[PDB]
Each structure stands twice: as structure tokens, then as C-alpha cells.
Write a protein that binds this DNA or RNA. Structure first.
Lengths: 96, 80, 103, 517, 105, 97, 107, 83, 99
DNA sequence: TCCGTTACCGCCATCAATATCCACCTGCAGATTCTACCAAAAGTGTATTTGGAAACTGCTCCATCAAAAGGCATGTTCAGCTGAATTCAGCTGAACATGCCTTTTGATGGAGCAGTTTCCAAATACACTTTTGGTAGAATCTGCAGGTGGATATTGATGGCGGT
DNA sequence: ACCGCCATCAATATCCACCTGCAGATTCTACCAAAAGTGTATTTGGAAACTGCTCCATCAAAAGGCATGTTCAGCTGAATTCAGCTGAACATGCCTTTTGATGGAGCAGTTTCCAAATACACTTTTGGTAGAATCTGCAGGTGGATATTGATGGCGGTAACGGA
């Protein structure tokens, strides 16, 4: 009715900002800017992964496709950090 | 009513001052007003089409944002 | 004879000061009521009896304000390139042409 | 009248939203301005004129034009200068100015423009010489006299503008502007005939016996006009007309030295008491569209061989004035240079060796010779006058007429003058006033002051005296003051081409009448 | 009993990313670890943006994040200059800049 | 037997559509590549706007309305309406027969 | 009927089942409407009609009976609508339109 | 084998003809190296996109399809080779 | 005695001639060697098909052709006939490729 | 022709009015904390199919050697020109004062916006049959490129008729 | 002797017509793997019908901005000149084209097999709307201390001048 689901990234962005800077605040608009930014980036990555996966007649999309999309969209200096962090995260997840 | 005189001389002068212009010619205003009108018409048509698609009689910032994103003019802040 | 000239500034001196003052400010510049009237009048052509929310009008105002600043910044380089100080319309026309929106 | 004047009214109507305040009669009760009837005595609008002309209540279109100008004047008088209604009325009047002219031209009239003369300066008895400036309050005296308010310790303002006169043709009966048709009562006492009536009957206007060419001729004027005609023929400009230069004044006078120099030198007997001279005045006329127009005039002072030293064998240019109406425009400077070079050559042939030029630009609102200079005629800068004189002198030297030209400082240094006695003395010159204000200290002060102003003054080196030209006594133009007063009193302005031509033909008529009563 | 975020040590709701991918209809079948990688990349990017915003705010003697600080942080980095080459920041203004030739003498 | 995989193209449809307007004008194989690339680009784009508007309306059913809106949004000027007309009449006759 | 296909039913030369199969295999959605392909085929055929019409006159005026990429480039560049629609499209063997400025002329 | 210095292979007549095709009347003698430097970033971007496409497919042969679909997303869609 | 055509008259000849031709003006062998050695940096022992190199050539040739008239109009804007690299920099920056 | 005299021009010096800077005080709303409450979402378990991978074999097409050559790349000389510096001459927006106005903020009356329930028409799936569109194979016809001859615009050089 | 404009002549380049050789376009013959139309059953999101409920649209005060009038000086445009620059032509020698042959790692097809996504059931938690209380950095207000532009004059440098 009046309390319909309107999930956002309000708590997550705040709690992430807590570690990097404890004595820092984000009043009203920074949340909207970051939400629009993350939505746009997610849309670009998902669309690129989808089209590149379709370009190979593959019915299953794995982390390799989205990784290729990230390397494609993000040039080398961010690409190496992205691939390193992704490999470390996936190895930690699989090991656990 | 013409409703095009709303862009006054001080307003356009102060807007041009942001670029570091020291001397402004006296006949720059007509063509920049025309450019503004033709640029706004393109997005107003898109917004009207988007609103008419949803069968809604009220326009929203959702239609404006996802009409501007197709022109390579993605806007941050009004997406939530 | 006579007494005059308390303090008179050289031409272009106040321009730098006002540019510096305005470059550190981020408030709006266009009045809301004339923009609302213009938007309503333009939208009258497409459909009649339409209601518009304030947030959409603010978004359109921001979008139209950013584009003019971008075009002015683009035309500044063209003007300085031609070894000229005054701004001429041909700068604006050629800046529009190079951007590819004239096609 | 309906079919001819309605295009202008429709053009006024379609100017949205300019004409909206004038579309309907003003209602003070429903507009918040109840005092309108107190300010405007005849409140009426466009719809009233439309109704009047639809019903044929106008005898002639002049009444319709007058009513339009009347509502424009009422709107201007009521609304303030910064009001939007004032701007609306102003631009509507401007548009009507271009819209009404073709209709009157096709209907057989001259023009449909409301033209008014310049505001005349008003004399006052506060200091016996005070002149009331334009748009100044004053106290009236039964409309026959006026007094200034500042020196005072009915009241009116100097905002009254004299309307242009009208003349009625003796055959068609139409009333039109006298200046536009260029009609004078003395020239044609039998009446005024419009061009349309003459064309219908294949008749021609009576030959003008008051033209400049019919004036008595002078040798100097003949030489000047011959040189101008030769130069123009060499140029061969298709738009060029016929230029006549004639000397109209030549009288002998004496200049009196001021008492300050009288005590220093005259009492000691080192210089003469007075210098005799002959003053000559000439004007230049060009025939444009079969009408004579004055476009150049000067006043000069020549010192004869019998003049006591150091004023021996010299000439001086007292004043210079002209109007920017010569055709072609590009050759006007060339024609002025040719006239000056011809005058210098004539005085050299007479024997004169030294020439003096004072390049003093006119002040704003002050006319040297031709009253009411056109607004489009920009006032030359002192630098501009110096450059023009330098170019004229270079051209004269190139013709082997002038040996050389210098500033006053270089001429004084070359002449090795020591005392102020050797300094040139002219009537109304700046140097006598400077010397009087100053009074070897005087010599040093004069040297410094004249070195400061050496750029303005120019000295020309050209190389008994007998003048073959007879004397022409004329008190109407004995000095620029009388000419200016006559032009102001008779509203003989030079603001427009038609007004300038009317002023020129009035001058020609006056000179012809005074020469032979 | 134990959430996937706790197992992977990631702050973002990795379950919500998987749920979005399921209803996003990008593919009829999706991998289990792909949403983890996508969330990690998004977290890295947003952490970069947040730390740059914090540095920009600290470079202005202020303890509050404002859109001007965001614009200054974005426009001072060439990677963000090219990456957000078509993105407009609200109330961000422009960078101060004056040409040398325009200076007198 | 062993044979290579087949390929798909719209050669016959293009060849037919050239005949009705210019029976005597010939077409070479070079321009078929450009034409196919252009038509595929148009198709994928218009499908993109159609699906995007469907997502905006959250409609689980894809129909003529969102592709109509995509045609209005994408093609600039009255040419869009042009296609609309024919498209409209097409679907109407597809409903009639 | 066993002989009247859907393509002939709508009076369109373009296929209607091929585009439907492409939409089904494109993974755009699990539900595909029946009325979309008939609308899309008409638009595609009509756009082909305009491109052919604009190529035909460019081919005729050159005293040529064979299609050349220059004719396609001329047809694209002389229309203010196609240029706006395809302003970011490069065509091989198309070239550029001749352009001589008045300033560069030896006046 | 790893060779180098092939940017000088773009002959002066080739660049002159390219400039003439663009309607240039007078050509300066110091812009050729500028163009050679400018082409570097475009060539690197194109090869990076193409090699990313090739490496994603686990193939050892580079095809024109990878190049054309890589140029499609850059805003330089090309017609003529299908797709 | 040589004809000695006046400067600027000859340019009309090739500006009229080249606009009527569309043949490639870049040699294939240096281009393929250049692309091979440039692409060798990312991966070694690569193999390229015949059509790939020509497709890349005809896709990269259009960029300069499309920039040429923009640079020409930029140079003419400065009341000059000669083109300068600053024109190219200005065009690239306004186009958004650089900034 | 050289030295004493003088006025003009310019370097640099303290200051006057204005602006910017920091320091202290005071009242206020958003951030922080705390409490309870409860429904959607996430955890495990079981069975099932299927998509990628293994080994094997056959088809393929690209680098390099090799040769004969005619046309274009490069060096050298000659000359016409067009951009940068100088000086001069006309003008419009910057910098003040003054009278007059309409932004901004303060509470309102009714038509769309949900909420809920039930029935309807199209979507999807399984099985049969005929058939149009790609294609291996082959034979046949023709418009287009090139060679050669002919006719016509176009341009520079030694003079020739007007102004200087 | 220069500068404009021009008739005449010899040499270039282009367009056109006639003729001939050839790769590409056109048409039978047929093909079984795959597509589509037809015949049934079933289910589910949306429309009709009723309701309660907010939010956009329409009037009133007082003073920091908004438009006019006046004056001017750095800014912009025009005429003149000179020397390093590139463009053209001729001679001489290297460089890409094409066709032939050969060797083998990469690619494609086939069968069977193993682990993971998915449809249900169950439960135990965790963040969002609600409330209240508390504090502290920040927007105005006032008060003194230095930095900046600039007209102006004391006096040195210097050029011009006149008598010896």
C-alpha cells in the first residue's frame, strides 16, 4: 500500500564511506549522484556482456563474459586493478 | 504571448561570463536563443512521446532522464 | 580646474574579478517563472491540457543551462585560436558544425 | 483615401503586441489612471480613425496623418520615458514613418513625415546676454518676453517646437510642405504650382533669377570655380554636378590692439596702433537636382602691403565650416582641398607669402557658420583637423604652389624672433588673449604656451598689393554672428538635404534683394 | 544461517545482485560467481569515487561533501575526464582557467 | 555425406523489391553487403528501443504499442509518421485478412 | 488454406516468420507478440524503398546504368534527414562532396 | 619477427594526396609528424578492441567480424561486410 | 621555355580529379607490416586473415578524410589558407575525443 | 661650432579610500542514539538432464624462394610571392548616479490515483504433411574497357590602342 | 616606360565514335532438412465497477535589482614592404606483381560421461516506519589589521637653443 518496496543503496554507500572517512557527511544529493552513476555503469556492463555473449552463440553467461566486458570498457590502468580484485575475490569465494 | 524575452540581457551576459569572455558582441543573442529553442524542442518531443507511451497525463523526470540518456547526455542525480 | 576621479578602474579590470567570483559559485542563473512559461508555451503545440511537475522543469533547466556553458567553453578556444579577443557568431556556427549536430 | 491609407493602418494593426494598447479606447476607470482626461484633452484611438475613414469623415489624408501624430504625441506626453507604452508608441511611429511615405508619394504629395524645427535659444535680461538652453524652465511675460529661473532670485518650459509651415497650390489646392517643394514667395509672386499640374499641362517652372550663378562675379571666385571644375572634369565622376564658387563679401576694416599690449609697446612707440586689413567672405554652391546648395564657406583676413609690420604680407583663416552634403561623398574632401589650394595659389599670385591656419574644432552645440549641423555630421577631432590640414599642405607642396609648411614653434625658431611684438596679431585670435592673460618673463611664458599648442596652429610659406576685385559692402554677413542670428530667426537649418537647400535658396534670395533693392 | 556476503566478505548485498540478474532477463541461465565479480567491480568503482570526493572535500577546508567537490575530483583526474566525457554533474560548475595570450602585455 | 553449413541472406527479397520500381536497373553484389548491414543496424536499433520502452512500462507482453513508440522516438521528422502510416495500414490489413 | 502464408496475408514481400524466429532466439524476452513482425517488416521495406528511390535518381543523372557506392554517398549526403539519422556512419568507397570556399577563390 | 619503425612507410605523396582530397590548397611541412602521432592512439584503441574480441572467443585467428563489432560500439559503424 | 603555371591554379586540377575517384591511395604491404608489428605487442604468434587488414585499412582511412574538411574550415575561420596543427587540436577537443 | 640655461618627460616615494581577512558570540535543526515489531528472504535437501570435454582423423592454405622489368622516387636549380612589423585613425562598451517595480512566501477547492475481485480471450505445446528457398552442376550471351583517329576550347608571347 | 585589355598563333588536353575480346549474370534439375498452418486442451493479466483521498491553481506586502543618460581610450582595421619558402622540370636507378610448389598445426565432426541449476517444503532472522531525547557545527552580527590602485610631484636625464 503505502510502504511498498523502494529498495536503494542508501545504507551500503554510507557504511562504505564510513571506513574511508569517519568524519565525513553526505547531506542530500551525493546519494542521488552515486546511485545514478552506479546504475549507469551497471547498465553499460550488463549490456556489453550480453551483446558479447550473444556474439558467440552461448546460452550461459559466466564471469568470463562480464570480465571481458569490463576489460573492454575499462582501459588498462583500471583494467589491471579490476582483473586482480576480481580474481582474488572469486578465488576467495571458491576456496571458502 | 511571445514568452521568448525571458532570456534577458544580464542573464545571457552572466552566463557567457562563465567562459571567461570579456567582450561580448551585440548580435550573439538571437542565434543562441534559436539554438536553445531547437535543442529544447528535440528533448521535449522525446519527453512527450515517452509520456504518451505510458498512457499518463503527467510528465515525470523518469521520462526526461531516459530520453536524455539516448542522446549521450546521461544525467546524474535525478535517477532515484 | 575642478576635482574629479576618486577611483576609476581600467577597462577589463572588473571583468577578471567578476569571473573569479562567479567561477566559485554554483547557484542557478535563469528565473524559474519565465522558464516555466516558455516550457508551457512550447508544450502547448504538441498536446493541450497538460500538467507538469516542478522536478521535471528543474531537470530541463539544468540540462539547458549545462549545454550553453559547454558551447561557450567550446567557442572560447575557437575565438582565441583566431588571434582575436571579441566573440563573433562564426565561432558559434563553426563550433556547432564541428560537433556534428548540424547533419 | 480609404484604399490608399488603409495599408498603413493595417501594418500598424498587425504589429502584435505593439498595437494592443491602441487597439481599444483607453478606459481610465478600468485601468487605474483616472487622471487621463486631466492630461490628454482629446483621448482617441486607432478604431476611432478607422470608423472616421470608413464613413468618409476626413476631407483629406493630411487630417488622418495629423490625427495619427496627435495620438502619438498624447501617448508620449502621458506615459513616462521608461514605460513600455512609450517604447511601443515610439516604434509604431517609426514604422509608420516608412509606411506612410510611399502612399503620399503615389498620391501626388511630397512626404508624410511630421517634421519640426530645432528649439530656438531664448534671450534673457538676467545678465543682458544670457541664452536659455534647450529644455530649460523659465518665467514668461505675456508670451512676449522670458526670464531665466536661476537668476530670478507665468512659468513655462522651453519644450515648445515650432511646426513646419505649409503652402497650398493655386490650381490643385493641395497643402504640402514648403521646404520639400522649395517654393519662395519673392521668386514666384504669382503663386505656387505643384509638379503634377505642370506635368499634366506640359509646363515648366519659371527660371530662378535668384540663383547663385546670377550673382555678381569675382576674379578670385572665378579662379576657384574654374579650378574646381577642371579637377572634377579630370576626375570625371558620373554623379558629380556643377560647382560654383563666388566671393560675396569684400570690405576694408581696421583691427585695434588691446590695452595690455598698448601699455607695453604702443606707449613706447615700438609698434603701430592699428592694422588695416581687407576681409573677404566666399561660399561654395553646387547644383544638385537643378537646385543650388551651399556646401562650403570661409572667412579670411588679408593684410595689405601698406599694413605696418610685422603683419606685412600675410593672410589668416578666421573660421572654417562645411556641411556633409556634397555629391559625390568621396570627392568632398578632394573638392575642399582643391578650393583651399586655389585660394592659396590666388593669394600667392597676388603676392602673399605667409598664411596662418587655426585648427580649432567646434564645440558641441556650437556652429561656426552653418547653423544646425546635421546629427549624422560627426564633429572632427583636433587630431583629425591636423591630419586633414597636413594632407592638404602636402598636396599643395606637390603642386609647386606652397614652398613649405611648419608649426608655429618651428616658424618662430627659424625666424629668430625675440619679443612679443613680432608675434602675428589677428582679429579674434587665441594669441592676443593668451598674451593679455599672461600680463623676458613674458617672452618665456609665450614660448612655453605656444610650444604647448604648436600642433593646433599651422604656418604656410607661399613665396605692393592691388585688388582688382571691387568692394562689396554687406552688413547681413559682416561676421558669423549676424549670419547665425538670421539663420536662427528664420529657422534656416542645415540638418537635412531639403532644409539645407531651402536655407541656401533663402540666402541667395536675401543676398540678391540686399544687393539691389 | 550464514549469508553469502559474510562468506565472501563483501559489503554489498550480493543476493540482491543475483536477484536483479535473474529478473533482468539477460540470459535464461546465469552463473553463481558472476554477480560476485560484478558487485566487486561496482564496489571498487564507487570506493574510488567516494575517496576522491573525500580528498576533494578535504582540499577545501570543509568536512561536508558537496557537488562542487565531486566535480573538482572528477575533472582533476584524466581517467574520469575521459570516462565521464558525456556525463554532466549537477551544480558542479566549471574548472577555473584563463589563457596566457589573453593576459595584457 | 559431409557438407558445409548453410548461410542465410535476404537476396531474393531485395531482388524482388528492386524490380517493381526499376525493372531495367541492375544491382551488383557489392551493394548487397552495405544494404544488409544497414537493414540489420536498423532492425537491432528499433528492437532496442522497443525492448527498452517495454522495460520502462514493466510490461511482460511485447506488442505493437511500444514498437510504435520506438518508431516515433527514433526516426526523426515526418518520415517517421510516413513509416507509421504504412506500418499501421499493414497491421490493419494483417488483421483484416 | 495450406497455401496462403502470413507474408502473403499482409501483402508484404519481406518475410514474417524469419524476423519472428530471430526475435525468439534473440533472448529479448520469453514472450513475443504476433503483431510485432508484421509492423517491423513494413517499416524495413519502406525504408528500403526510400533508400532505393534516393539511389535511383543519383544513378540516373550520371549517365550510368550500374549502382556505384558514389551514388549511395550522394543520396545520403544530399538529404538533411538521412544525414541526421546516419551522421556517425562511414561508407566505404563513398568519398566526400566537393566544396570550394569563396574566400580561397583568387578574387 | 619483431620489426619497428613502419610509421615512416606513409610516404609524402600519400599524405599530400590525402590533404588534396580534403580541399587543402596550401600544405605546411611540419604537420606530417603530427598526423603520424595522432594516428597512434586510434590504431592502439582499434587493435586493443580487436584483440580483446579475439581473446574472448579463445580463437587464434583474428576475423573482420571482431573488428566491425568493436568499431560499432565506438560510434564508427561500418556497412559492407554484413553484421 | 617552361609554361610555369601560376601557383594555386594547378591545385584545381587535382581537387577536381580526386573527388571523381574512390580508389585506395595507401600501399597495402607497408600497412599490413605496420599493423602486424603494432598488434604483436599485445599477443605473439598471431595469424590474420586477408580481409581483416583491408577492412581495417578502409575503416581507418575515413577518419582523416572526415577530419580534413573540418581542419580546412577551422583554418579558413582564422582568415588564413594554410592549415596548422592547432586546427586539428581544436577540432579534436571540441569533438570531445580529447577533452 | 661648443657650453650654460631651461623646460619636458619619466622613476619612484609616502599615502587615501576601499576591500579582504580573522576572531568571538548566539541561537537552531539534522545527525546520532535508543526501543519495539514483523513479514519477505535466505539457508538445506533430493532428483534430474544436459552442456562442455576426452581422443581420433581428415582437409586446408600461407611463408619463402625465384625471376624480369618499366615507371616513379630523389637530387638540383630557378624564381614569384605572401606573411610579419610599423604607423596611423575612428569608435563603442565600461563606469557612475537615480527613479521605479515585481520576486518570494503565505492556505486554500475537486478530478485522477490506487485497491479489490472475477471472467475472458490469447499464448503455448504436440503431431503431420507439403514445400520454397540455398545450392552442386553446367551451358549461354553481352555490356564495358581499351586502341586510334578527328575535332575543338584554352593559354602564353611579340605587339597595339587608351591614361600617367 | 607602366598598367588594362586584347586579336592572333602554336601546342595540350579532352570528348566522341567505331571496333573487338571476356568474366559475370541468367536459367534448368533437383534435393530432403527444416518451417508453417491446422487441430485441441488449459491458464492468467487486464478491464469494469465501485470507493476514499490529496495536490495544483488563484490572491496580497515592501525594497534590492532594472533600465537611461553621459563620457572616453584601448581596440580594430587599412596601406606598405621584403626575403625564406615551395613548386616545377629533368635525369637515373631500385621495387612491387604475379605465378608455382610444398609442408603440417589448427579447425570441425562424433560419442559418452559428470557436476550444477532448478522446483518445492520448512524455519529464523533484520531492516524500514514509528516514536522521543540530546547535542553541536554553522549562518549572522560586530570589531580591528594590512594589501591594492593610482593621481601626483621632487628631481635626474636629456634635447634644443643661442651667443661666443
Amino acid at each position: 500500500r503505502k510502504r511498498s518496496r523502494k529498495e536503494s543503496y542508501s545504507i551500503y554507500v554510507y557504511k562504505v564511506l564510513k571506513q574511508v572517512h569517519p568524519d565525513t557527511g553526505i547531506s542530500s544529493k551525493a546519494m542521488g549522484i552515486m546511485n545514478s552513476f552506479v546504475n549507469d555503469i551497471f547498465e553499460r556492463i550488463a549490456g556489453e556482456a550480453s551483446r558479447l555473449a550473444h556474439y558467440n552463440k552461448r546460452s550461459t553467461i559466466t564471469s568470463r563474459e562480464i570480465q571481458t566486458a569490463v576489460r573492454l570498457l575499462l582501459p588498462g590502468e583500471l583494467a589491471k586493478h579490476a582483473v586482480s580484485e576480481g580474481t582474488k575475490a572469486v578465488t576467495k569465494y571458491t576456496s571458502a | 504571448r511571445d514568452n521568448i524575452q525571458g532570456i534577458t540581457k544580464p542573464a545571457i551576459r552572466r552566463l557567457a561570463r562563465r567562459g571567461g569572455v570579456k567582450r561580448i558582441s551585440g548580435l550573439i543573442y538571437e542565434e543562441t536563443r534559436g539554438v536553445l529553442k531547437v535543442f529544447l524542442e528535440n528533448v521535449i518531443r522525446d519527453a512527450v512521446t515517452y509520456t504518451e507511451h505510458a498512457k499518463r497525463k503527467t510528465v515525470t523526470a523518469m521520462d526526461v532522464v531516459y530520453a536524455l540518456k539516448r542522446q549521450g547526455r546521461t544525467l546524474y542525480g535525478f535517477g532515484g | 580646474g575642478g576635482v574629479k576621479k576618486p577611483h576609476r578602474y581600467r577597462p577589463g579590470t572588473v571583468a577578471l574579478r567578476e569571473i573569479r567570483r562567479y567561477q566559485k559559485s554554483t547557484e542557478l542563473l535563469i528565473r524559474k517563472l519565465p522558464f516555466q512559461r516558455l516550457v508551457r508555451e512550447i508544450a502547448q503545440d504538441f498536446k493541450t491540457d497538460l500538467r507538469f511537475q516542478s522536478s521535471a522543469v528543474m531537470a530541463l533547466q539544468e540540462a539547458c543551462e549545462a549545454y550553453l556553458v559547454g558551447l561557450f567553453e567550446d567557442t572560447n578556444l575557437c575565438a582565441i585560436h583566431a588571434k582575436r579577443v571579441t566573440i563573433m557568431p562564426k565561432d558559434i556556427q563553426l563550433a556547432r558544425r564541428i560537433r556534428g549536430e548540424r547533419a | 483615401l480609404r484604399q490608399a491609407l488603409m495599408p498603413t493602418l493595417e501594418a500598424l494593426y498587425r504589429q502584435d503586441p505593439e498595437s494592443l494598447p491602441f487597439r481599444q479606447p483607453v478606459d481610465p476607470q478600468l485601468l487605474g489612471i483616472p487622471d487621463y482626461f486631466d492630461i490628454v484633452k482629446s483621448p482617441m484611438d486607432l478604431s476611432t480613425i478607422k470608423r472616421k475613414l470608413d464613413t468618409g469623415q476626413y476631407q483629406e489624408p493630411w487630417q488622418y496623418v495629423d490625427d495619427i501624430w496627435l495620438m502619438f504625441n498624447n501617448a508620449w506626453l502621458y506615459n513616462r520615458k521608461t514605460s513600455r507604452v512609450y517604447k511601443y508608441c515610439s516604434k509604431l511611429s517609426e514604422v509608420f514613418e516608412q509606411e506612410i511615405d510611399p502612399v503620399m508619394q503615389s498620391l501626388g504629395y511630397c512626404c508624410g513625415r511630421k517634421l519640426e524645427f530645432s528649439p530656438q535659444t531664448l534671450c534673457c535680461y538676467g545678465k543682458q546676454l544670457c541664452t536659455i538652453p534647450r529644455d530649460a524652465t523659465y518665467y514668461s511675460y505675456q508670451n512676449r518676453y522670458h526670464f531665466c529661473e536661476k537668476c530670478f532670485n507665468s512659468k513655462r518650459k522651453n519644450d515648445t517646437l515650432d511646426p513646419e509651415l505649409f503652402v497650398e497650390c493655386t490650381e490643385c489646392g493641395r497643402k504640402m510642405h514648403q521646404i520639400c517643394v522649395l517654393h519662395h514667395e519673392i521668386i514666384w509672386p504669382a503663386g505656387f504650382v505643384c509638379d503634377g499640374c505642370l506635368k499634366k499641362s506640359a509646363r515648366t517652372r519659371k527660371e530662378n533669377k535668384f540663383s547663385a550663378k546670377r550673382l555678381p562675379s569675382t576674379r578670385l571666385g572665378t579662379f576657384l570655380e574654374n579650378r574646381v571644375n577642371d579637377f572634377l572634369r579630370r576626375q570625371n565622376h558620373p554623379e558629380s554636378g556643377e560647382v560654383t564658387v563666388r566671393v560675396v563679401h569684400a570690405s576694408d576694416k581696421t583691427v585695434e590692439v588691446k590695452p595690455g599690449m598698448k601699455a607695453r609697446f604702443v606707449d613706447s612707440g615700438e609698434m603701430a596702433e592699428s592694422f588695416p586689413y581687407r576681409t573677404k567672405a566666399l561660399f561654395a554652391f553646387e547644383e544638385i537636382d537643378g537646385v543650388d546648395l551651399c556646401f562650403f564657406g570661409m572667412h579670411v583676413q588679408e593684410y595689405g602691403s601698406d599694413c605696418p609690420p610685422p603683419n606685412q604680407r600675410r593672410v589668416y583663416i578666421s573660421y572654417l565650416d562645411s556641411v556633409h552634403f556634397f555629391r559625390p561623398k568621396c570627392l568632398r574632401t578632394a573638392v575642399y582641398h582643391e578650393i583651399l589650394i586655389g585660394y592659396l595659389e590666388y593669394v600667392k599670385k597676388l603676392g602673399y607669402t605667409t598664411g596662418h591656419i587655426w585648427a580649432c574644432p567646434p564645440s558641441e552645440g556650437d556652429d561656426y557658420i552653418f547653423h544646425c549641423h546635421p546629427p549624422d555630421q560627426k564633429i572632427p577631432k583636433p587630431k583629425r583637423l591636423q591630419e586633414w590640414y597636413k594632407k592638404m599642405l602636402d598636396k599643395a607642396v606637390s603642386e609647386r604652389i606652397v614652398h613649405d609648411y611648419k608649426d608655429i614653434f618651428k616658424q618662430a625658431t627659424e625666424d629668430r624672433l625675440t619679443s612679443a611684438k613680432e608675434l602675428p596679431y589677428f582679429e579674434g585670435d587665441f594669441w592676443p588673449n593668451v598674451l593679455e592673460e599672461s600680463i623676458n618673463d613674458l617672452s618665456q611664458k609665450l614660448y612655453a604656451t605656444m610650444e604647448k599648442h604648436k600642433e593646433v596652429f599651422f604656418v604656410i610659406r607661399l613665396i605692393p598689393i592691388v585688388d582688382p576685385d571691387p568692394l562689396i559692402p554687406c552688413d547681413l554677413m559682416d561676421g558669423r554672428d549676424a549670419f547665425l542670428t538670421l539663420a536662427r530667426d528664420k529657422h534656416l537649418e542645415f540638418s537635412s538635404l531639403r532644409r539645407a537647400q531651402w536655407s541656401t535658396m533663402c540666402m541667395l534670395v536675401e543676398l540678391h534683394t540686399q544687393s539691389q533693392d | 544461517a550464514k549469508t553469502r556476503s559474510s562468506r565472501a566478505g563483501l559489503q554489498f548485498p550480493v543476493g540482491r545482485v543475483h536477484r536483479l540478474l535473474r529478473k533482468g532477463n539477460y540470459s535464461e541461465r546465469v552463473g553463481a560467481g558472476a554477480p560476485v565479480y560484478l558487485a566487486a567491480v561496482l564496489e571498487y568503482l564507487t570506493a574510488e569515487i567516494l575517496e576522491l570526493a573525500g580528498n576533494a572535500a578535504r582540499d577545501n577546508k570543509k568536512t561536508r561533501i558537496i557537488p562542487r567537490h565531486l566535480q573538482l575530483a572528477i575533472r582533476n583526474d584524466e581517467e574520469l575526464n575521459k570516462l565521464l566525457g558525456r556525463v554532466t554533474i549537477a551544480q558542479g560548475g566549471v574548472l577555473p582557467n584563463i589563457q596566457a595570450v589573453l593576459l595584457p602585455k
